Amino acid sequence: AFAVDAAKAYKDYLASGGQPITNCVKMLCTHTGTGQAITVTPEANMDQESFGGASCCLYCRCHIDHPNPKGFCDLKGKYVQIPTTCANDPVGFTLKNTVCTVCGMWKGYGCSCD
Amino acid sequence: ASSQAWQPGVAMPNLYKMQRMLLEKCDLQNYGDSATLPKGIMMNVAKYTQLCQYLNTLTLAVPYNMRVIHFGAGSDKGVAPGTAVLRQWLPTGTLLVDSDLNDFVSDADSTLIGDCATVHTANKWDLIISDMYDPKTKNVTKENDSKEGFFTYICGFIQQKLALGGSVAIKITEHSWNADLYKLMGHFAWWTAFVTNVNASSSEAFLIGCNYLGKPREQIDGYVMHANYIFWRNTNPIQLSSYSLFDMSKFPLKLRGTAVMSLKEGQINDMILSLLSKGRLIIRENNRVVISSDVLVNN
Numbered sequence A: 001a002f003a004v005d006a007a008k009a010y011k012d013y014l015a016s017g018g019q020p021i022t023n024c025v026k027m028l029c030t031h032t033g034t035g036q037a038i039t040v041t042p043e044a045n046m047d048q049e050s051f052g053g054a055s056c057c058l059y060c061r062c063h064i065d066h067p068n069p070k071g072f073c074d075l076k077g078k079y080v081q082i083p084t085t086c087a088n089d090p091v092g093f094t095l096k097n098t099v100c101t102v103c104g105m106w107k108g109y110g111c112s113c114d
Numbered sequence B: 001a002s003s004q005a006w007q008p009g010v011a012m013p014n015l016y017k018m019q020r021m022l023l024e025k026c027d028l029q030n031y032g033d034s035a036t037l038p039k040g041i042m043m044n045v046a047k048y049t050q051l052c053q054y055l056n057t058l059t060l061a062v063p064y065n066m067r068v069i070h071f072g073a074g075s076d077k078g079v080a081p082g083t084a085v086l087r088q089w090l091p092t093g094t095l096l097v098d099s100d101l102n103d104f105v106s107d108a109d110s111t112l113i114g115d116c117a118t119v120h121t122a123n124k125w126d127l128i129i130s131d132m133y134d135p136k137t138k139n140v141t142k143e144n145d146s147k148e149g150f151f152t153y154i155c156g157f158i159q160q161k162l163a164l165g166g167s168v169a170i171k172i173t174e175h176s177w178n179a180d181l182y183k184l185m186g187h188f189a190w191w192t193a194f195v196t197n198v199n200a201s202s203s204e205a206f207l208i209g210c211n212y213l214g215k216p217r218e219q220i221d222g223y224v225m226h227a228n229y230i231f232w233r234n235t236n237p238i239q240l241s242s243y244s245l246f247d248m249s250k251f252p253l254k255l256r257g258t259a260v261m262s263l264k265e266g267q268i269n270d271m272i273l274s275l276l277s278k279g280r281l282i283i284r285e286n287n288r289v290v291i292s293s294d295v296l297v298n299n
């Protein structure tokens, strides 16, 4: 069946000079959190910014089916921590980067399990 | 800047509630002015953050598996900033349902799209937040009379789906208001009109009903109380402030583990009313939560 690949389509739209998805809901927090990638409550640290999950999910924002089997979303209802230097495009960050299964931090931005 | 600038907002003083003023036009001294918000923070994140900061000082009932419904949660941006704040503020395990006339993505457990009039629910709620506002209210062509529309629904929803001991926060403005809604505030242990310091240059306010008693504790004339609210806003300029936003250490709502009992109208004496009045008790069924949206069908 023809699968509409939107994950790469966005990487192509950006790489060709395109406006990143805005209106991502940034939250007010102490910035003294664990610094983990996805959390039930804002856990941004002094180097991060917390955002509402649903607002940072490409699938939710574009109203399209979710890759995860059953249509389960990993961001809706959670909060995603984004490095301040990459907070201008939270959606693009969640796609490109991956979360460490051990510590629960972003790999290359907090995960030091090696 | 008076000590009010350090509060999340300002509540209508008791002496203004006891007046009997006639409805005058609202003319704010700073109408139009905008507050300085923390870098990259949306107005509605700041607004809901101050509302929740104020709700923390009230005797809200907070049981395990608390039930919160949020009407008017959508925006022209397609996201729900206010719902994101409620998710942050409410204890984990709290059921949060939001709804709006237009489609939007939310962090709520469940979202209903459509006119609030089409929303049905078998169970009762512990907290109701309404940020509904009809854009047609901006067309003032006659006298400022009591508005109906979604307010009619909200009054019926509170009387039938609000748990005893439950609380409400309904958004109003100079022209977006209802007389029956002010009368219902008299069915709570306590009520007030709350103005956020970040939107102090707006006639906007949240009518807060604290601890629903199910019966009139006070006799309130809606037309008179709205005139009193306008008189208060016209005579008390509030200085725009976002200072309360820079301290989020005590933000989360404390889980009081309030008791939930399924009593009948015959087992409600004065002893029980005093517990409801202190957010020490919630009265409602504790069955599964079922919501539905009516779908009108056309050929």
Ligand SMILES: [C]O[C]1[C]([O])[C]([C]OP([O])(=O)OP([O])(=O)OP([O])(=O)O[C][C]2O[C](N3=[C]N([C])C4=C3N=C([N])[N]C4=O)[C]([O])[C]2[O])O[C]1N1[C]=NC2=C1N=[C]N=C2[N]
Residues within 6 Å of the ligand: B026, B027, B028, B029, B031, B133, B134, B135, B137, B138, B140, B173, B174, B175, B176, B199, B201, B202, B203, B204
């Ligand atoms: C998201 O949250 C929004 C806001 O936070 C909240 C309220 O916002 P507001 O603009 O502050 O409203 P207000 O002017 O303070 O009161 P009003 O009832 O709208 O008066 C209507 C009319 O009366 C006149 N007036 C009112 N006042 C108080 C005056 C004045 N004139 C003066 N010289 N001095 C004044 O003091 C003016 O001309 C107005 O147009 O409602 C939401 N909301 C607004 N618009 C929409 C919307 N939501 C969805 N779609 C919308 N289109």
Ligand SMILES: C[n+]1cn([C@@H]2O[C@H](COP(=O)(O)OP(=O)(O)OP(=O)(O)O)[C@@H](O)[C@H]2O)c2nc(N)[nH]c(=O)c21
Residues within 6 Å of the ligand: B014, B057, B058, B059, B060, B189, B190, B210, B211, B277, B278, B279
């Ligand atoms: C904020 N609040 C006020 N009241 C009632 O309103 C009265 C006046 O309360 P107030 O808010 O008008 O002023 P005050 O600074 O005295 O508030 P306090 O810190 O509660 O004393 C109180 O004595 C209570 O009877 C309240 N009653 C209930 N049940 N719940 C509340 O959250 C609440």
Ligand SMILES: C[S@@+](CC[C@H](N)C(=O)[O-])C[C@H]1O[C@@H](n2cnc3c(N)ncnc32)[C@H](O)[C@@H]1O
Residues within 6 Å of the ligand: B044, B071, B072, B073, B074, B075, B076, B079, B080, B081, B082, B083, B099, B100, B101, B102, B114, B115, B116, B117, B131, B132, B133, B134, B135, B149, B150
């Ligand atoms: C001020 S906006 C809500 C903003 C939202 N609380 C936020 O966090 O950004 C008011 C909302 O009320 C909704 N609304 C107005 N009348 C309604 C009705 N009868 N039923 C449902 N929603 C309604 C509008 O669709 C609009 O999105």
Ligand SMILES: [Cl-]
Residues within 6 Å of the ligand: B007, B009, B010, B011
């Ligand atoms: Cl106050």
Ligand SMILES: [Cl-]
Residues within 6 Å of the ligand: B042, B043, B044, B045, B081
């Ligand atoms: Cl906003």
Ligand SMILES: [Zn+2]
Residues within 6 Å of the ligand: A054, A057, A058, A059, A060, A061, A066, A073, A074, A075, A076
């Ligand atoms: Zn999603």
Ligand SMILES: [Zn+2]
Residues within 6 Å of the ligand: A100, A101, A102, A103, A104, A105, A111, A112, A113
């Ligand atoms: Zn790791």
